Design an enzyme around this catalytic site. Structure first.
Site, PDB file in Angstrom:
ATOM      1  N   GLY A 297       0.808  -1.249   0.000  1.00 32.65           N
ATOM      2  CA  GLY A 297       0.000   0.000   0.000  1.00 32.65           C
ATOM      3  C   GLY A 297       0.830   1.284   0.000  1.00 32.65           C
TER       4      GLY A 297
ATOM      5  N   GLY B 240       2.977   2.677  -2.457  1.00 31.83           N
ATOM      6  CA  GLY B 240       3.316   3.335  -3.726  1.00 31.83           C
ATOM      7  C   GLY B 240       4.612   2.856  -4.325  1.00 31.83           C
TER       8      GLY B 240
ATOM      9  N   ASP C 129       4.362  -0.224 -13.786  1.00 33.57           N
ATOM     10  CA  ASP C 129       4.809  -1.040 -12.626  1.00 33.57           C
ATOM     11  C   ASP C 129       5.227  -2.429 -13.119  1.00 33.57           C
ATOM     12  OD1 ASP C 129       4.184   1.297 -11.494  1.00 33.57           O
ATOM     13  OD2 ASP C 129       2.498   0.523 -10.301  1.00 33.57           O
TER      14      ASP C 129
ATOM     15  N   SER D  91       4.003  -2.976  -4.625  1.00 36.45           N
ATOM     16  CA  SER D  91       3.842  -4.324  -4.042  1.00 36.45           C
ATOM     17  C   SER D  91       2.939  -5.140  -4.994  1.00 36.45           C
ATOM     18  CB  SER D  91       3.275  -4.273  -2.620  1.00 36.45           C
ATOM     19  OG  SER D  91       1.943  -3.750  -2.593  1.00 36.45           O
TER      20      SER D  91
HETATM   21  N1  ADP Z   1       3.350 -10.172  -0.819  1.00 34.39           N
HETATM   22  C1  ADP Z   1       2.052  -9.878  -0.807  1.00 34.39           C
HETATM   23  N2  ADP Z   1       1.196 -10.731  -0.189  1.00 34.39           N
HETATM   24  C2  ADP Z   1      -0.108 -10.442  -0.213  1.00 34.39           C
HETATM   25  N3  ADP Z   1      -0.734  -9.419  -0.788  1.00 34.39           N
HETATM   26  C3  ADP Z   1       0.132  -8.615  -1.429  1.00 34.39           C
HETATM   27  C4  ADP Z   1       1.498  -8.777  -1.490  1.00 34.39           C
HETATM   28  N4  ADP Z   1       2.070  -7.774  -2.252  1.00 34.39           N
HETATM   29  C5  ADP Z   1       1.048  -7.050  -2.643  1.00 34.39           C
HETATM   30  N5  ADP Z   1      -0.151  -7.481  -2.150  1.00 34.39           N
HETATM   31  C6  ADP Z   1      -1.467  -6.941  -2.441  1.00 34.39           C
HETATM   32  O1  ADP Z   1      -1.340  -5.723  -3.155  1.00 34.39           O
HETATM   33  C7  ADP Z   1      -2.093  -4.672  -2.478  1.00 34.39           C
HETATM   34  C8  ADP Z   1      -1.438  -3.320  -2.630  1.00 34.39           C
HETATM   35  O2  ADP Z   1      -1.655  -2.816  -3.915  1.00 34.39           O
HETATM   36  P1  ADP Z   1      -1.803  -1.256  -4.148  1.00 34.39           P
HETATM   37  O3  ADP Z   1      -2.865  -0.675  -3.283  1.00 34.39           O
HETATM   38  O4  ADP Z   1      -1.855  -0.987  -5.621  1.00 34.39           O
HETATM   39  O5  ADP Z   1      -0.392  -0.794  -3.533  1.00 34.39           O
HETATM   40  P2  ADP Z   1       1.138  -0.763  -4.027  1.00 34.39           P
HETATM   41  O6  ADP Z   1       1.510   0.674  -4.514  1.00 34.39           O
HETATM   42  O7  ADP Z   1       1.876  -1.231  -2.847  1.00 34.39           O
HETATM   43  O8  ADP Z   1       1.245  -1.741  -5.126  1.00 34.39           O
HETATM   44  C9  ADP Z   1      -2.199  -5.144  -1.021  1.00 34.39           C
HETATM   45  O9  ADP Z   1      -3.380  -4.516  -0.543  1.00 34.39           O
HETATM   46  C10 ADP Z   1      -2.325  -6.658  -1.216  1.00 34.39           C
HETATM   47  O10 ADP Z   1      -3.628  -6.992  -1.624  1.00 34.39           O
HETATM   48  O1  GLA Z   2       2.022   7.203 -12.254  1.00 37.34           O
HETATM   49  C1  GLA Z   2       0.893   6.771 -11.545  1.00 37.34           C
HETATM   50  C2  GLA Z   2       0.946   5.183 -11.395  1.00 37.34           C
HETATM   51  O2  GLA Z   2       0.104   4.722 -10.460  1.00 37.34           O
HETATM   52  C3  GLA Z   2       0.009   3.424 -10.189  1.00 37.34           C
HETATM   53  O3  GLA Z   2       1.252   2.919  -9.518  1.00 37.34           O
HETATM   54  C4  GLA Z   2      -0.244   2.553 -11.474  1.00 37.34           C
HETATM   55  O4  GLA Z   2      -0.030   1.174 -11.287  1.00 37.34           O
HETATM   56  C5  GLA Z   2       0.787   2.910 -12.607  1.00 37.34           C
HETATM   57  O5  GLA Z   2       0.378   2.337 -13.701  1.00 37.34           O
HETATM   58  C6  GLA Z   2       0.701   4.484 -12.733  1.00 37.34           C
HETATM   59  O6  GLA Z   2      -0.517   4.896 -13.307  1.00 37.34           O
HETATM   60 MG    MG Z   3       0.028  -0.921  -7.101  1.00 34.04          MG
END
Ligand code: ADP
Ligand code: GLA
Ligand code: MG
Ligand code: ADP
Ligand code: GLA
Ligand code: MG
Ligand code: NA
Ligand code: NA
Lengths: 391, 391
Positions: free
Chosen positions: B135, B137, B185, B140
């Site tokens: 979560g 940025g 990403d 993950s």
């Molecule tokens: N190793 C992991 N194990 C379980 N869930 C994961 C893992 N890595 C990522 N996630 C999932 O990805 C989500 C985060 O995604 P998002 O909100 O787009 O954040 P980020 O910028 O970290 O990618 C978490 O809420 C979870 O569902």
């Molecule tokens: O630059 C903003 C950025 O935001 C998130 O991380 C999305 O996964 C990427 O595709 C991009 O849109």
């Molecule tokens: Mg993400």
């Protein structure tokens, strides 16, 4: 028949079985490294210039296992290698360093071991198999160095960058093989990605992936199956000629000399020196133009630049030969051939031809017909660079 | 102090270990895929824009084993993954697809399985561990997707392109997490190289690897420890506001619109959509200038373009928060800091700060004093992309 290009699973199987026979067990570790064709930008890498090679589906596979005894035990299945095809020697110590010797093929491997930046390296047993023709100008040397490097990484991880590994493979070629190459062959063998060519800036070491994957396009590689005596010989002479011309013009390299500055200062350098700089400075510009053309889908423009590159290498750098000239003159005659030129260091080796996929069969028949010698052909896509294979 | 960044050997051992406990045997296969920081080019990738991410040492390690029974059994050790942290479910069949359900975190894996393009795919058991903060940025989400994809490749070789693997992971994020992300990403997770940033042209999918070779330049990541979940944020609304501006001006995307054109077209779109599009069009221009600055060592320029990125994301795109704003103002007050900005999707997560290496310790103390919350810190090098780890 264009020549067949075994896939990795086939080369891996051949390597495993040859190792099983030689050492009496299955190998623990495997890696691959490709050969190389240069689409354009010849004799630019050691001038800090631009090159646009792609990795071929032609490749070296190396399988092996660690030992506990500090020994290296090698076998190569390539005929083309000087005898014996087997060698064993102890790892270097801070007390005794490895040494170039015979058989000459082992120098490429000893050199990579000698400069491998990480420790401690265990001994190992290894078998090499290759689909790269040894000494055909498709860079079997860099394939072998980079396979060797990638294998050592499986025994003892490095902590450096792609470009540091290329420089280790390059130094091995310089000190052990006695051949002062630039960075291009090691770099593309490491950095290739399938369906791309690689615009390598040999000064910044910035790389761009240029798409080269359209089903209506083919790259055809013509092995002249010749190697004149000036190979061992004029390559270092040219490299020295270029460094003089740069000094005479107050330039760290010919990369810093603009094509319009050069014209307006012929009087500072020999008539021979001038013609060398003109090739290098123009080829850099042609390589930048050719990369933009290839991204755009402009095969005609790319083809013209390939030919302009051939004329420059033939008349201004004089690293072509009669056989390469003959093979390029036959290729352009074929309808659908966008362009053709001498590729690699030259004085023999290969031509690269870009053409309509539909014309390859004709193009292969016409070029065989109009070449005195016996020519060999690869229809080759852009391939991946060096990999680990999990066994 | 920088929060330390476990190396792979250590994540691997924590994964072997949680796998042995959960499933009563050693895993047979292993993979890693990194998180990323975006240096500049925010909210451009889904507008066919330019971005300049680097991969991080923060990574997802996935270990597992083919199964006999056509089921999928997963565990994650990440705290912050919604309960349950273990589940089993049948493979998708021709008769019936997987569907998004509970728990939310496994939608990322289900989606990659659903869209994985090669067959037949066997059941499997797998453990996931990560140094990537969930979560925050640093992607993950894409680290998890790309790790999963690289794993499936070990069960059942694919034979597409690096690019098609990213568009599978993207496809999974759209359809299974309901988060309409761009390609950035997934691409960087796949394409990373240590000591490089990646300039991605999201229209053509051309990439350059830009060397970050300078030991006097650091990248400092500051986690605000305010968590975004991008799915339920204003992210899909921004994407749609960009789409409605393109459609209104008759552009395939905002990559096709220049600032001066957008400015004469105010009467075609809302006040809000104009502001969103002005960020995007501006940010595409700035990322090209930033790459040019980085290429010649002009870190003060690069840093001024990052500050402009941040003011555009704060005021026109409205994806900052009071916390990211304080973290940026605080880093800018520190001498040796070139620039700072929010990175990723926003609404929380991380800033990225470019600065003299020697200033990192001052910079960390200053930003912490001047931060209302509790910041965590990564001092980050450019890292390798997704990899097979031979067991
Ligand atoms: N190793 C992991 N194990 C379980 N869930 C994961 C893992 N890595 C990522 N996630 C999932 O990805 C989500 C985060 O995604 P998002 O909100 O787009 O954040 P980020 O910028 O970290 O990618 C978490 O809420 C979870 O569902
Ligand atoms: O630059 C903003 C950025 O935001 C998130 O991380 C999305 O996964 C990427 O595709 C991009 O849109
Ligand atoms: Mg993400
Ligand atoms: N698979 C291999 N096994 C043994 N020796 C090899 C192998 N590949 C390359 N070599 C060595 O490299 C040499 C060829 O390199 P070179 O003359 O630079 O031509 P090229 O690199 O164009 O093939 C061979 O003569 C041999 O010494
Ligand atoms: O383009 C000329 C070329 O020649 C040989 O193939 C060398 O190995 C390369 O380093 C390069 O100089
Ligand atoms: Mg060679
Ligand atoms: Na013939
Ligand atoms: Na604080």
């Amino acid at each position: 028949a264009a020549l067949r290009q075994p896939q990795v699973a086939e080369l891996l199987a051949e390597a495993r079985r040859a190792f099983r026979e030689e050492f009496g067990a299955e190998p623990e570790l495997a890696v691959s490294a490709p050969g190389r064709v240069n689409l354009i930008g010849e004799h630019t890498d050691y001038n800090q210039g631009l090159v646009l090679p792609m990795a071929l589906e032609l490749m070296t596979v190396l399988v092996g296992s660690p030992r506990k005894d500090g020994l290296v035990s090698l076998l190569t299945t390539s005929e083309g290698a000087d005898e014996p095809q087997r060698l064993q020697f102890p790892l270097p110590t801070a007390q005794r360093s490895l040494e170039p010797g015979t058989p000459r093929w082992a120098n490429y491997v000893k050199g990579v071991i000698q400069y491998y930046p990480a420790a401690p390296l265990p001994g190992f047993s290894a078998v090499v198999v290759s689909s790269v023709p040894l000494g055909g100008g498709l860079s079997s040397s860099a394939s072998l160095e980079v396979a060797t490097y990638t294998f050592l990484q499986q025994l003892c991880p490095d902590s450096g960058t792609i470009a540091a590994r290329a420089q280790v493979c390059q130094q091995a070629e310089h000190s052990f093989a006695g051949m002062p190459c630039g960075i291009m062959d090691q770099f593309i063998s490491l950095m290739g990605q399938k369906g791309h060519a690689l615009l390598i800036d040999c000064r910044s070491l910035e790389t761009s992936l240029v798409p080269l994957s359209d089903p209506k396009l083919a790259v055809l590689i013509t092995n002249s199956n010749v190697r004149h005596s000036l190979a061992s010989s004029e390559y270092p002479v040219r490299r020295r000629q270029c460094e003089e011309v740069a000094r005479a013009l107050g330039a760290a390299s010919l990369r810093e000399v603009q094509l319009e500055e050069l014209e307006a200062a012929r009087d500072l350098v020999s008539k021979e020196g001038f013609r060398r700089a003109r090739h290098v400075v123009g080829e850099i510009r042609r390589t930048a133009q050719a990369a933009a053309a290839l991204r755009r889908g402009d095969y005609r423009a790319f083809g013209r630049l390939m030919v302009e590159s051939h004329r420059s290498l033939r008349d201004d750098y004089e690293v072509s030969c009669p056989e390469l000239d003959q093979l390029v003159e036959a290729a352009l005659a074929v309808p659908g051939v966008y362009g053709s030129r001498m590729t690699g260091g030259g004085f023999g080796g290969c031509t690269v031809t870009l053409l309509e996929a539909s014309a390859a069969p004709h193009a292969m028949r016409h070029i065989q017909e109009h070449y005195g010698g016996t020519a060999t052909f690869y229809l080759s896509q852009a391939a991946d660079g060096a990999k680990v294979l999990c066994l």
